[PDB]
Design an enzyme around this catalytic site. Structure first.
Site, PDB file in Angstrom:
ATOM      1  N   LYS A   1       0.889  -1.445   0.459  1.00  0.00           N
ATOM      2  CA  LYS A   1      -0.273   0.002  -0.217  1.00  0.00           C
ATOM      3  C   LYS A   1       0.923   1.283   0.135  1.00  0.00           C
ATOM      4  O   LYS A   1       0.744   1.942  -1.218  1.00  0.00           O
ATOM      5  CB  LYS A   1      -0.664  -0.275   1.150  1.00  0.00           C
TER       6      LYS A   1
ATOM      7  N   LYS B   1      12.715  -0.094   2.453  1.00  0.00           N
ATOM      8  CA  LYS B   1      11.775  -0.257   2.268  1.00  0.00           C
ATOM      9  C   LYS B   1      10.758   1.158   2.142  1.00  0.00           C
ATOM     10  O   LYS B   1      11.166   1.851   3.277  1.00  0.00           O
ATOM     11  CB  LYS B   1      10.503  -0.665   4.050  1.00  0.00           C
ATOM     12  CG  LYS B   1       9.704  -0.345   4.263  1.00  0.00           C
ATOM     13  CD  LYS B   1       8.236  -1.473   4.558  1.00  0.00           C
ATOM     14  CE  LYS B   1       6.882  -0.774   4.449  1.00  0.00           C
ATOM     15  NZ  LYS B   1       6.648  -1.561   5.300  1.00  0.00           N
TER      16      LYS B   1
ATOM     17  N   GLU C   1      15.901  -6.401   7.347  1.00  0.00           N
ATOM     18  CA  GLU C   1      17.134  -7.970   6.528  1.00  0.00           C
ATOM     19  C   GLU C   1      15.772  -8.680   5.571  1.00  0.00           C
ATOM     20  O   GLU C   1      14.773  -8.077   5.720  1.00  0.00           O
ATOM     21  CB  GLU C   1      16.730  -8.665   8.319  1.00  0.00           C
ATOM     22  CG  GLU C   1      16.894 -10.142   7.980  1.00  0.00           C
ATOM     23  CD  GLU C   1      16.880 -11.151   8.575  1.00  0.00           C
ATOM     24  OE1 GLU C   1      15.892 -10.696  10.206  1.00  0.00           O
ATOM     25  OE2 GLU C   1      16.738 -12.419   8.649  1.00  0.00           O
ATOM     26  N   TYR C   2      17.351  -8.774   5.197  1.00  0.00           N
ATOM     27  CA  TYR C   2      16.740  -8.691   3.548  1.00  0.00           C
ATOM     28  C   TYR C   2      16.009 -10.664   3.298  1.00  0.00           C
ATOM     29  O   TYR C   2      17.309 -11.205   3.997  1.00  0.00           O
ATOM     30  CB  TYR C   2      17.920  -9.049   2.027  1.00  0.00           C
ATOM     31  CG  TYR C   2      17.916 -10.068   1.191  1.00  0.00           C
ATOM     32  CD1 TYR C   2      16.308  -9.979   0.541  1.00  0.00           C
ATOM     33  CD2 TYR C   2      19.164 -10.909   0.920  1.00  0.00           C
ATOM     34  CE1 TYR C   2      16.730 -11.083  -1.442  1.00  0.00           C
ATOM     35  CE2 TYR C   2      18.737 -11.416  -0.832  1.00  0.00           C
ATOM     36  CZ  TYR C   2      17.174 -11.529  -0.834  1.00  0.00           C
ATOM     37  OH  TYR C   2      17.881 -11.811  -2.368  1.00  0.00           O
ATOM     38  N   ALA C   3      15.664 -10.711   3.116  1.00  0.00           N
ATOM     39  CA  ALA C   3      14.560 -12.353   2.665  1.00  0.00           C
ATOM     40  C   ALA C   3      14.507 -12.891   1.593  1.00  0.00           C
ATOM     41  O   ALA C   3      13.925 -12.344   0.445  1.00  0.00           O
ATOM     42  CB  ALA C   3      13.314 -12.741   3.600  1.00  0.00           C
TER      43      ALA C   3
ATOM     44  N   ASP D   1      -1.903  -7.970  11.883  1.00  0.00           N
ATOM     45  CA  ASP D   1      -1.724  -8.269  10.104  1.00  0.00           C
ATOM     46  C   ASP D   1      -0.596  -9.655   9.909  1.00  0.00           C
ATOM     47  O   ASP D   1      -0.456  -9.555   8.676  1.00  0.00           O
ATOM     48  CB  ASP D   1      -1.350  -7.131   9.767  1.00  0.00           C
ATOM     49  CG  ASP D   1      -1.253  -6.772   8.108  1.00  0.00           C
ATOM     50  OD1 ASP D   1      -3.235  -7.342   7.781  1.00  0.00           O
ATOM     51  OD2 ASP D   1      -1.023  -6.059   7.793  1.00  0.00           O
TER      52      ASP D   1
ATOM     53  N   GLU E   1       1.602 -12.831   3.012  1.00  0.00           N
ATOM     54  CA  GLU E   1       1.836 -11.703   2.324  1.00  0.00           C
ATOM     55  C   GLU E   1       3.151 -11.224   2.670  1.00  0.00           C
ATOM     56  O   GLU E   1       4.206 -10.406   2.429  1.00  0.00           O
ATOM     57  CB  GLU E   1       1.233 -10.627   1.242  1.00  0.00           C
ATOM     58  CG  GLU E   1       0.736 -10.115   1.716  1.00  0.00           C
ATOM     59  CD  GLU E   1      -0.022  -9.266   0.504  1.00  0.00           C
ATOM     60  OE1 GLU E   1      -0.046  -9.508  -0.180  1.00  0.00           O
ATOM     61  OE2 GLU E   1      -1.125  -8.720   1.263  1.00  0.00           O
ATOM     62  N   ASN E   2       2.983 -10.781   4.391  1.00  0.00           N
ATOM     63  CA  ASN E   2       3.898 -10.651   5.265  1.00  0.00           C
ATOM     64  C   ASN E   2       4.406 -11.581   5.849  1.00  0.00           C
ATOM     65  O   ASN E   2       5.199 -11.970   7.018  1.00  0.00           O
ATOM     66  CB  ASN E   2       2.607  -9.684   6.876  1.00  0.00           C
ATOM     67  CG  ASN E   2       2.118  -8.730   6.524  1.00  0.00           C
ATOM     68  OD1 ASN E   2       2.995  -7.862   4.665  1.00  0.00           O
ATOM     69  ND2 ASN E   2       0.931  -8.160   6.105  1.00  0.00           N
TER      70      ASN E   2
ATOM     71  N   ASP F   1       6.234  -7.158   8.477  1.00  0.00           N
ATOM     72  CA  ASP F   1       5.207  -6.143   8.572  1.00  0.00           C
ATOM     73  C   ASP F   1       4.785  -5.892   9.816  1.00  0.00           C
ATOM     74  O   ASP F   1       3.183  -5.624   9.675  1.00  0.00           O
ATOM     75  CB  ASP F   1       4.519  -6.164   7.316  1.00  0.00           C
ATOM     76  CG  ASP F   1       3.520  -4.757   6.643  1.00  0.00           C
ATOM     77  OD1 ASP F   1       3.500  -3.917   7.290  1.00  0.00           O
ATOM     78  OD2 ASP F   1       2.827  -5.233   6.064  1.00  0.00           O
TER      79      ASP F   1
HETATM   80  N1  LIG Z   1      13.098  -7.594   3.675  1.00  0.00           N
HETATM   81  C1  LIG Z   1      12.078  -8.335   2.978  1.00  0.00           C
HETATM   82  N2  LIG Z   1      12.251  -9.434   1.327  1.00  0.00           N
HETATM   83  C2  LIG Z   1      12.556  -9.849   0.634  1.00  0.00           C
HETATM   84  N3  LIG Z   1      10.758  -9.546   0.287  1.00  0.00           N
HETATM   85  C3  LIG Z   1      10.514  -8.115   1.347  1.00  0.00           C
HETATM   86  C4  LIG Z   1      10.692  -7.766   2.764  1.00  0.00           C
HETATM   87  N4  LIG Z   1       9.619  -6.789   3.046  1.00  0.00           N
HETATM   88  C5  LIG Z   1       9.165  -6.941   1.701  1.00  0.00           C
HETATM   89  N5  LIG Z   1       9.497  -7.820   1.261  1.00  0.00           N
HETATM   90  C6  LIG Z   1       8.006  -7.893   0.208  1.00  0.00           C
HETATM   91  O1  LIG Z   1       7.322  -6.926  -0.022  1.00  0.00           O
HETATM   92  C7  LIG Z   1       6.100  -6.556   0.121  1.00  0.00           C
HETATM   93  C8  LIG Z   1       5.483  -5.350   0.508  1.00  0.00           C
HETATM   94  O2  LIG Z   1       6.575  -5.027   1.849  1.00  0.00           O
HETATM   95  P1  LIG Z   1       5.772  -4.620   3.116  1.00  0.00           P
HETATM   96  O3  LIG Z   1       7.128  -4.721   4.498  1.00  0.00           O
HETATM   97  O4  LIG Z   1       4.507  -5.892   3.760  1.00  0.00           O
HETATM   98  O5  LIG Z   1       4.974  -3.265   3.035  1.00  0.00           O
HETATM   99  P2  LIG Z   1       3.360  -2.761   3.221  1.00  0.00           P
HETATM  100  O6  LIG Z   1       3.663  -2.120   4.230  1.00  0.00           O
HETATM  101  O7  LIG Z   1       3.236  -1.981   1.984  1.00  0.00           O
HETATM  102  O8  LIG Z   1       2.763  -3.659   3.091  1.00  0.00           O
HETATM  103  C9  LIG Z   1       6.476  -8.020   1.223  1.00  0.00           C
HETATM  104  O9  LIG Z   1       4.954  -8.522   0.543  1.00  0.00           O
HETATM  105  C10 LIG Z   1       7.471  -8.588   0.524  1.00  0.00           C
HETATM  106  O10 LIG Z   1       7.130  -8.564  -1.532  1.00  0.00           O
HETATM  107 MG   LIG Z   2       2.875  -1.469   6.458  1.00  0.00          MG
HETATM  108 MG   LIG Z   3       2.645  -5.665   4.099  1.00  0.00          MG
END
Ligand SMILES: Nc1ncnc2c1ncn2[C@@H]1O[C@H](COP(=O)(O)OP(=O)(O)O)[C@@H](O)[C@H]1O
Ligand SMILES: [Mg+2]
Ligand SMILES: [Mg+2]
Ligand SMILES: CCc1ccc(OCC(=O)N2CCCCC2)cc1
EC number: 2.7.11.1
Length: 265
Positions: free
Chosen positions: A17, A36, A85-87, A130, A134-135, A148
């Protein structure tokens, strides 16, 4: 301390978002991380400054192998940058889209890892609120990490911000705007366990208005392939009355979880 000039930016990892999330490398150390990016006009517009602050303060002080680290943040007059941290193995969401459904052993191992991470959060009276595919991200050994923390809080609580998108993981007390506590993460753990085994969450519908009805009545059924032990666990978690949902120790010690999970408490 940090600024943009300190990083080489690379490919997009995903979108949310508000978050636009990138792979990046720190120039002097060559450290690989996820940046981010949040637009300030858009945070001001939605009025979610307090949410960003909660995300930074709660996630940077937690330390658990099944929770994603946040290392820092900086800011540049149009954007806020969170240093994560990178996943490397991506989201559970992508993995479910690839395989359609998970088998029992994959499902129970993810549930053990989730309940470990949540048990740690709850021990500080931090509620995530939450939990959804996707989180949940995956480390280099395929281990699950909660990420997240933008909706997370201290219990007990009401909801003072508008629900934006999907109702599918939220319990009755929460969609009805009532009061709530720790037990909302238990309910989302039931929904996840069902969606892992079946391929879709249990109250899914074509409209917001019908999803809302199915959740507030707890109207779900099981396909024939779901086993008796899975059914038992999911049925204990998806209870209308929060006080009847199990404690997380009971989840981690459920017979079906101990038969199938390949990791411990
Ligand atoms: N540390 C990370 N490593 C790999 N991919 C990530 C990581 N953080 C976010 N992502 C990707 O980015 C998307 C959005 O990150 P998020 O932290 O969940 O944003 P929002 O707060 O807008 O939901 C995640 O659903 C995942 O696809
Ligand atoms: Mg958020
Ligand atoms: Mg998210
Ligand atoms: C700006 C890039 C950056 C990178 C790392 C960092 O801390 C790293 C850190 O504490 N660990 C400790 C645990 C194992 C290695 C990661 C802060 C900022």
């Amino acid at each position: 301390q940090w600024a943009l000039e300190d990083f080489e930016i690379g490919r997009p990892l995903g979108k949310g978002k508000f978050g636009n999330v990138y792979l990046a490398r720190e120039k002097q150390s060559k450290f690989i991380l996820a940046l981010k990016v949040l637009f300030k006009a858009q945070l001001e517009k939605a009025g979610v400054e307090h949410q960003l602050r909660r995300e930074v303060e709660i996630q940077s002080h937690l330390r658990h192998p099944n929770i994603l680290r946040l290392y820092g943040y900086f800011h540049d007059a149009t954007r806020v940058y969170l240093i994560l941290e990178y996943a490397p193995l991506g989201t559970v969401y992508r993995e479910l889209q690839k395989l359609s459904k998970f088998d029992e052993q994959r499902t129970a191992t993810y549930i053990t890892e989730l309940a470990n991470a949540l048990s740690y959060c709850h021990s500080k009276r931090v509620i995530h609120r939450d939990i959804k595919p996707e989180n949940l991200l995956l480390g280099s050994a395929g281990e699950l990490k909660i990420a997240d923390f933008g909706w997370s809080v201290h219990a007990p609580s009401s909801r003072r911000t508008t629900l934006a998108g999907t109702l599918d993981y939220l319990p009755p007390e929460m969609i009805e705007g009532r009061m709530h506590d720790e037990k909302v993460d238990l309910w989302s753990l039931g929904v996840l366990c069902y969606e892992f085994l079946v391929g879709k969450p249990p109250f899914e519908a074509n409209t917001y208005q019908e999803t809302y009805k199915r959740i507030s009545r707890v109207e779900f059924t099981f396909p024939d392939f779901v086993t008796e032990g899975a059914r038992d666990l999911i049925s204990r978690l998806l209870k209308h009355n929060p006080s009847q949902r199990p404690m997380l120790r009971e989840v981690l010690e459920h017979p079906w979880i101990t038969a199938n999970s390949s990791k411990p408490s």
